[PDB]
């Protein structure tokens, strides 16, 4: 919106940057049984057959 | 199954090695009247005819 001034844009940008960094944090931190599910692209095998 | 972590496989392999050693031990130990049945592949003949 063009109504907002430069200070308003900076105040918005600070919060967006905080949210973006929080996204990276939540991505990195979560892990299951010593394995981070979201860390790397890969394939996880579930051996469901006897 | 791939869910179990790397540390899990070490304990699993330790228990596996314990079981394998127990199998080898029971194979070697068992004997009948000074004769180890499972020590060597062999034949024993029972004399059932006069």
Curated annotation (Swiss-Prot), chains A, B:
Q: Where is the signal peptide?
A: none
Q: Where in the cell is it found?
A: Secreted; Bacterial flagellum
Q: Which family does it belong to?
A: Belongs to the bacterial flagellin family.
Question: What is the purpose of this protein?
Answer: Flagellin is the subunit protein which polymerizes to form the filaments of bacterial flagella.
**Name used for this protein in its record:** Flagellin
Species name for this entry?
Answer: Escherichia coli O127:H6 (strain E2348/69 / EPEC)
First and last residues shown, out of full length? 101 to 150 of 548
């Amino acid at each position: 919106t063009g109504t907002n001034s430069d200070s308003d844009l900076d105040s918005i940008q600070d919060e967006i940057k905080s949210r973006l960094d929080e996204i990276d944090r939540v991505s990195g931190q979560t892990q299951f049984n010593g394995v981070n599910v979201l860390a790397k692209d890969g394939s996880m095998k579930i051996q469901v057959g006897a």
